[model samples]
Target: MLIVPYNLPLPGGVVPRMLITILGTVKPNANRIALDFQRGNDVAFHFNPRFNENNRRVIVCNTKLDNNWGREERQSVFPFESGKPFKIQVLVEPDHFKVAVNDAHLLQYNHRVKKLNEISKLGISGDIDLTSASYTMI
Candidate 1:
């Protein structure tokens, strides 16, 4: 498990368009892997891939505001496999965030935090071996 903060000083501080790229591998005994985008104490987005939850094959997306979780988006297809390496990209837009897993479009989430610039940190955890991660503002 690893927790990494986004580019501080932000270059221009969380513009409407930014890309978050992550490269990691799922452990053979993996249960879940989650990536969280944080704004202060709130979680702007939670991207979780569950390998075994409810008997495997589910990807859950949600947000947390004021210490409470919003409605979950769980209809997205699973794009991960145990012990496999993957590259994920999250593109932040004005109204939504689009995610691509392994270079394939996966899903999108509508902005819940409203203020994009407030999301200043990221966290990666659970049953994974991260190789590289980066953020780019464009």
Candidate 2:
């Protein structure tokens, strides 16, 4: 069981071949959800999905450095729905992070901070019921 606005301090940071899994269900009438990989207040990766009522739905990914956000990458394929469950996996590679949703490849983000071993926190927040979260290194 997990709670909203949860912060899990990543032990040993991260390494190549690492995999992170997060499971949750979106709340009805939800507007947005965010999963962030952070280190000392700097976000190495920001994965956010927004479903604005009466507006467009998008999955936005970006990086935040020095309190400034990098270029935003928006994807129109809304894979999640309110009142539905989701499985998200982020694979750590040598040069990028490979993301999968519902066991299908969704997106890839190249290393921005270049210090995977320094990303020490994984934060989750938004209108969702988080059920499980785990990690594996192969």
Candidate 3:
């Protein structure tokens, strides 16, 4: 029910045990997409899914501190498909973000910025039709 490049505020910012859920469908001709948890200008979590990387699909995760991106963590087991719907649940643990796609555990991204309470925005963009996004304590 929303367009691409959508950014929404997390009601009380991020905290441990919070579950951030995103529901969407990938575009048929999609190449790459990104979801970011932003704290003002800094990105606490940068979750990117690249559909084509030398004929392979991968999920790349990272963090941006002071506008500089840190080392990326790549997961080659891509669970998303073009033209298909997906359910992404990001569990905010004390040390990392545990990600799951379509009801299955996917990857974990350790917090580089550490200040979770100030991470207030969720940004969704590129190659997908965003159905809904919300967060709650779990």
Off by over 4 Å in 2: none
The candidate 2 region of ten consecutive residues with least summed lDDT is 7-16
Candidate 3 vs. true structure, TM-score: 0.96
How far in Å is the alpha carbon of 65 misplaced in model 1? 1.4
Which candidate order results from sorting by TM-score in descending order? 3, 2, 1
Q: What digit string (tens of lDDT, one per residue) describes model 2 on residues 1-138?
A: 798898877887877898999999999989999989997788998999999835988888999999999998876677888999999899989988888999989888888987777898999989899998888987
Give candidate 3 misplaced runs (Cα > 4 Å): none
Candidate 1 runs further than 4 Å off: 1-13
Q: Pick the candidate with the highest lDDT.
A: 3
Model 1 scores a C-alpha lDDT of 0.80
Q: Per-residue error at 107 for model 3, in Å?
A: 0.5
Model 3 over residues 1-138: C-alpha lDDT tens digits? 998799889866789999989999999979998999998899999999999888889999988889899999996789999999999999999899999999999999988877788999999998998999888888
Q: Is 1 or 3 the stronger prediction by TM-score?
A: 3
Best by TM-score: 3
Query: What Cα-based lDDT does every candidate model obtain?
Result: 0.80, 0.88, 0.91
